[PDB]
Design a protein around this ligand. Structure first.
Ligand code: AR6
Ligand code: MG
Length: 358
């Protein structure tokens, strides 16, 4: 349904804005303090996002979505990648006060849309941030059909690699896009992690045949895979055939500690592996509760705008606006653009088509 695509785009942006709070909550490392301030504001249902700007996450996600819309039906990947690179480069003019990420901004300005392979960048050991994952969800809105899985894999990886040429970075884009497609198709969330694990060898097959920095990509592959395997084992969902099990003590402070344990270097949710992982952990626990989703994915001491942007997209696809206080989105920055782009993505994604690959 079109309304679920609208909710996916709008609630991803609402999550971003809520987990950002004009920077005040993004950069507060104490989840308990964030939750105290939330209560002082009146709780989530009382928050009005009219003055809560979206961050770079939404600006980039909209850039991905607009490129997908402009590429049209039965698109050529050469054209799509030109449009993606152009939109990523141009959207850096809309980052004032949005705390843009390092790899995202630097590499977007390096791109040369219009040269052949001009959106390709070298492998880099420090390009494992979540900036590719945070902007990839709508790739799954565009390519949700089983027949399009190879396109979803290729486009999510290449969109990611335009700024994050490191498997920890671009495999997060794959996870973000893939789980959105699963949500579109009503696949139960407890099956999603297993689906990602089964598709990682197909992602590797693409990277190898693509031929760029194969040795470096392979040398760094194990980190993302191992972190996800261990997380899925901890939750009891490695094979996709069990309800998840959560720890007995899993309040705000315990979640901050857990998110730090998942992190690469201490900031939970800031990398390609852990931004979608924390969003997924929130989805698994929250079911149809927007408030629980927010408490787990929007309001924590880590990189909360990025886990929120991912979680809000997946949740909106599944549940629409049901149980969401209107003040959480009615006056949201870019609401009209988000809704119009979502409707255009729906017209494309709901109509199964075939892409002309590279
Ligand atoms: N090999 C690596 N493996 C895992 N994580 C890494 C690696 N290298 C860096 N990191 C982490 O990658 C983290 C971020 O890398 P940055 O390049 O600044 O940013 P972005 O472009 O990805 O976007 C970050 C977004 O998240 C917020 O919402 C922000 O506002 C952005 O919107 C660093 O802390 C690194 O520790
Ligand atoms: Mg951000």
């Amino acid at each position: 349904g079109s309304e679920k695509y609208v909710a996916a785009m709008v609630l991803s942006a609402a999550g971003d804005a809520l987990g950002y709070y004009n920077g005040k909550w993004e950069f507060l490392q104490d989840g308990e303090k964030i939750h105290r301030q939330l209560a002082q504001l009146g709780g989530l249902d009382a928050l009005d996002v009219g003055r809560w700007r979206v961050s770079d996450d939404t600006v980039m996600h909209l850039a991905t979505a607009e490129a997908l819309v402009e590429a049209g039906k039965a698109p050529k990947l050469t054209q799509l990648y030109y449009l993606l690179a152009k939109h990523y480069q141009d959207c850096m003019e809309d980052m004032d006060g949005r705390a843009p990420g390092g790899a995202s901004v630097h590499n977007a300005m390096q791109l040369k849309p219009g040269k052949p392979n001009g959106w390709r960048i070298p492998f880099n050991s420090h390009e494992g941030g979540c900036g590719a994952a945070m902007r990839a969800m709508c790739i799954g809105l565009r390519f949700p059909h089983h027949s399009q899985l190879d396109t979803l894999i290729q486009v999510s990886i290449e969109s990611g690699r335009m700024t994050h040429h490191h498997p920890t970075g671009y495999l997060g884009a794959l996870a973000s896009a893939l789980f959105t497609a699963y949500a579109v198709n009503s696949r139960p969330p407890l099956q999603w992690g297993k689906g990602l694990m089964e598709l990682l060898p197909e992602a590797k097959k693409y990277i190898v045949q693509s031929g760029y920095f194969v040795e470096e990509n392979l040398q760094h592959w194990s980190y993302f895979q191992t972190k996800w395997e261990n997380y899925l084992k901890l939750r009891g969902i490695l094979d996709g055939e069990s309800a998840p099990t959560f720890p007995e003590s899993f309040g705000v402070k315990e979640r901050d500690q857990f998110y730090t344990s998942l992190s690469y270097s201490g900031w939970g949710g800031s990398s390609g592996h852990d931004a979608p992982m924390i969003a997924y952990d929130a989805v698994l626990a929250a079911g149809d509760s927007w408030k629980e989703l927010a408490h787990r994915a929007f309001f924590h001491g880590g990189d909360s705008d990025s886990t929120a942007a991912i979680a809000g997209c997946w949740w909106g696809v599944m549940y629409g606006f049901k149980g969401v206080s209107p003040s959480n989105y009615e006056k949201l920055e870019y609401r009209n653009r988000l809704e119009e782009t979502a409707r255009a993505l729906y017209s494309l994604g709901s109509k199964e088509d075939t892409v002309i690959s590279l």
